[PDB]
Structure 1
């Protein structure tokens, strides 16, 4: 089997991407944030505290003839950005772009934190990291990809995120028309439950490539590119007027600037992030100070190749017995 679904930016800044997902019988379509940095599939639902719902589409398990309460199971998750959610668990039929899993754990939110309530465009998350990170207790549950894997033509999924435009998630096949050149594969450690790999270095604009190992995660659920302070300083040093602002919480730059590109290494290959991908617009409405798309990972504890990086590439998440990651230009 295979599946293919279009993924769409939630806003003009590509703050996140949503992908339609069919849940239950008859289908209830929710727009979920596919997140390779976590491993829970959770949804706004008929069980979510009413005051915490503000425009999201909800899953109502009582209206699904295939929904079954998973007895005694609960979940609770806290993300790197301080947001959180929790609730109970159903199993139900879940389909993505034509690919169907029966008995998928669908984690129904009873509580969500303010940032979720405040974002009417995201109806939940679909985790695509390794199932070892799944928070369901007392019996850990598998991700959608883990459940689908054996049935797929090839045990892979691909992320092809657009810049200010739609893109595609494919399951079970590699669309050879979706990228240029070849796909360079690189080793993955699953030891922390993430798609964790080591970049071979970086360049800023037309500058010389610096060979240096950067361990990080491929995370479609993080908006920006978080890298070591030395790397980030080298980037923003090339932008007149850019500075790290403690009050704003990162590097800001004059909105009038033209940003340089940023290149990262995948083996001997190179992925070039155009400067425009690094502009996240005014810090507040009407401001001429703009937020940077490359930020320090210091105090996160891990480097994160988030959407800013991933959207410059066609990315293969290879779930073979020994997982690997593949990157191609596009």
Structure 2
């Protein structure tokens, strides 16, 4: 089997991407944030504290004839945002691919950042099932449950810049990229799609060969890299500065940003400069927020949407997982 669904930016800045998901019988369609950095499928629900719902579409398990409460099971996750609740099993379909018995984690509580984002109805985790938070019996991701049925045990992320994109399950659309796909090793030891980039370049500058361990994380907006790398990037933008009050590098909105290249083996993925502009820091300001930021406070480097949307990305869930990147 295969599935294919369109993913859409939630706003004009590509702050996140939503993908429609059918849950239950009859179907209840929710728009979920597909997150390759986490492993829970959780949703706003009829159980969510009413004051914490502000425009989201909710899952109502009592209206699904296939929903079954998973007795004694709870979940709780933190990303500074958080959410928690109880657990149903139900039928879940993405893009025509159906899993029966998927754990659907129904929120009783969500933090303010989720409440304040009316466009995101929950998350669909695509990291490794070792990170799933359900207790006392951990549950499998949608991809893990689907994998044996898929034509090939893979999914692909093709995120658009200011444009729609696609998540495919079970096949690699050879028309969606240029050149070849370069595959690179993955460590699953921390439960992530963790890999090592071979280096970087800023604009038209020389490529610096250096190992950068990080995660391919569709649920993170920005590109978080070591302080040395990030300083080298912003040094090429006249007037850019790290702002303690804003919480990262900012730059004059009138600037033209250079591209940023990252290495995948001997291959190179070029992020156009415009992908790195996250707009005014507050409405009407002429200072803009940068899309490449230091990972120093995080403890891991994160190839978030800024990086991934410059590529066609293969999440290969074969017995030894790998990641593939192609230009597009």
> Which residue of structure 1 aligns with residue 287 of structure 2?
289
The offset of 1:227, in angstroms, is 0.0
Cα deviation digits, residues 21-41 of structure 1 (max 9, x gap): 000000000000000000000
> Which residue of structure 1 aligns with residue 245 of structure 2?
247
2-structure distance, mates of 1:286, 1:164: 21
Cα deviation digits, residues 309-328 of structure 1 (max 9, x gap): 00000000000000000000
2-structure distance, mates of 1:23, 1:182: 36
> Which residue of structure 2 aligns with residue 136 of structure 1?
134
Where structure 1 has 5 or more consecutive residues not aligned to the other structure, the ranges are none
SS class of match (1:251): strand
Where structure 2 has 5 or more consecutive residues not aligned to the other structure, the ranges are none
The offset of 1:299, in angstroms, is 1.3
Question: What is the TM-score when the length of structure 2 is the normalising length?
Answer: 1.00
SS class of match (1:226): strand
Cα deviation digits, residues 124-153 of structure 1 (max 9, x gap): 000000000000000000000000000000
Alignment length, in residue pairs? 328
The offset of 1:264, in angstroms, is 0.1
1-structure distance, mates of 2:82, 2:315: 26
2-structure distance, mates of 1:287, 1:146: 45
> Which residue of structure 2 aligns with residue 92 of structure 1?
90
Q: Which runs of 4+ in 1 moved over 4 A?
A: none
Cα deviation digits, residues 229-283 of structure 1 (max 9, x gap): 0000000000000000000000000000000000000000000000000000000
1-structure distance, mates of 2:86, 2:262: 41
Cα deviation digits, residues 67-102 of structure 1 (max 9, x gap): 0000000000001xx000000000000000000000
Q: Once superposed, what is the RMSD of the aligned Cα atoms?
A: 0.1
The offset of 1:118, in angstroms, is 0.1
> Which residue of structure 2 aligns with residue 225 of structure 1?
223
**What are the residue-to-residue correspondences of 1:234-273 with 2, within 5 Å?**
234-273=232-271
2-structure distance, mates of 1:317, 1:287: 39
